[PDB]
Structure 1
Amino acid sequence: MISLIAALAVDRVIGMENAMPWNLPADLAWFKRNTLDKPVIMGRHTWESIGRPLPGRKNIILSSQPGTDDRVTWVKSVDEAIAACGDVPEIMVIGGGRVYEQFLPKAQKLYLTHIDAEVEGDTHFPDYEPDDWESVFSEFHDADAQNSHSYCFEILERR
């Protein structure tokens, strides 16, 4: 099953860590927790943004160009990326934007973190149809000493 995982600010704006105005370690534990022991697919820009493979995960980079790093698996199409995952129960898509767009139509679940924050940004999570997805989990949290802003984890499943 393919799942997408992302953190959204006001308006579906998503962005790179450094581009993030917020500081939410709880959001990171959540991402860690939901992606550990699974393959994660991401695009070039996001790869470079992270700069090191993520541990305890098979890291697949969807890129149109040859790869310049032997620590990860490089693929060139969506179908290749999915075949590179092998037979597993859940594949995790970690963005970026384009990547999110291409996999949504095949995804069966979405793990989203809604952050109580307005930020001007270049990109957005694809617009998905609410009638087609069921919110089966949700949990809001106020900000705090570690967490800079309020946020809400939600998990939806395609109906």
Structure 2
Amino acid sequence: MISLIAALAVDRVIGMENAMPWNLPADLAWFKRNTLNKPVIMGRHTWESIGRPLPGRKNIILSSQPGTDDRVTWVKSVDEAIAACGDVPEIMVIGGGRVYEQFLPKAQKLYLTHIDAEVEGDTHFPDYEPDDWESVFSEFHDADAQNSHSYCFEILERR
């Protein structure tokens, strides 16, 4: 099974200048709890943004050119990225915008955090069709001393 996981601010904005301009450790914790001990597939810009391998995960990086770090696995196509995950129950796709667009039609489940934050951005999650998905989990949280915006964790499954 292929799943996407992403955090979306207003108007589906997911990044600006190769960074994520919010700070929500509650959402980083959700990300870790949902990805740990799974393979993660990401694009080269997201790799550069994160800046280091994500421990306890098989990191798979898409790039059309040769890899530059043997702490991670580098592949050159969507089909090769999937294959390098081996026979696992769940493959997590962790972005960015260009990678999410390609994996969207292949995926069975979306783990989306909806952040109540107004962000000028230059990267957007794909414009996904409502009718194709069913929401199986949602959980709203107000802002607090650690998390400066409200946020909702949703899980959707493909109908």
Instruction: Give the TM-score band, short-chain normalised.
Output: over 0.9
Secondary structure of residue in 2 paired with 1:59: strand
Task: Give the unaligned 5+ runs of structure 2.
Answer: none
CA distance in 1, matches of 2:51, 2:16: 12
| Alignment size in residue pairs | 159
Task: Give the unaligned 5+ runs of structure 1.
Answer: none
CA distance in 2, matches of 1:101, 1:38: 21
Note the alpha carbon deviations across 1:50-69, whole angstroms, 9 max, x for none.
11100000000011010110
Note the alpha carbon deviations across 1:43-90, whole angstroms, 9 max, x for none.
000001111100000000011010110100000000000000000000
CA distance in 2, matches of 1:61, 1:123: 18
The structural deviation recorded for 1:123 is 1.3
Cα gap change, 1:67/1:18 in structure 2, threshold over 3 Å: closer, same or farther? closer
> Is contact 1:108-1:158 (8 Å) kept?
yes
Cα gap change, 1:17/1:113 in structure 2, threshold over 3 Å: closer, same or farther? farther
Q: Which residue of 1 aligns with 2:121?
A: 121
> Is contact 2:26-2:147 (8 Å) kept?
yes
Note the alpha carbon deviations across 1:20-58, whole angstroms, 9 max, x for none.
332111101100000000000000000011111000000
- Give me the identity figure in percent: 99
Cα gap change, 1:18/1:61 in structure 2, threshold over 3 Å: closer, same or farther? closer
Q: Which residue of 1 aligns with 2:17?
A: 17
> Is contact 1:61-1:75 (8 Å) kept?
yes
CA distance in 2, matches of 1:26, 1:49: 19
Q: Which residue of 1 aligns with 2:66?
A: 66
Q: Which moved more, 1:81-90 or 1:12-21?
A: 12-21
> Is contact 1:16-1:49 (8 Å) kept?
no
**Structure 1 length as normaliser, TM-score?**
0.97
The structural deviation recorded for 1:17 is 9.7
Secondary structure of residue in 2 paired with 1:49: helix
Secondary structure of residue in 2 paired with 1:18: coil
> Is contact 1:113-1:151 (8 Å) kept?
yes
> Is contact 1:3-1:107 (8 Å) kept?
yes
Secondary structure of residue in 2 paired with 1:17: coil
Cα gap change, 1:144/1:136 in structure 2, threshold over 3 Å: closer, same or farther? same
> Is contact 1:16-1:46 (8 Å) kept?
no
Cα gap change, 1:18/1:83 in structure 2, threshold over 3 Å: closer, same or farther? closer
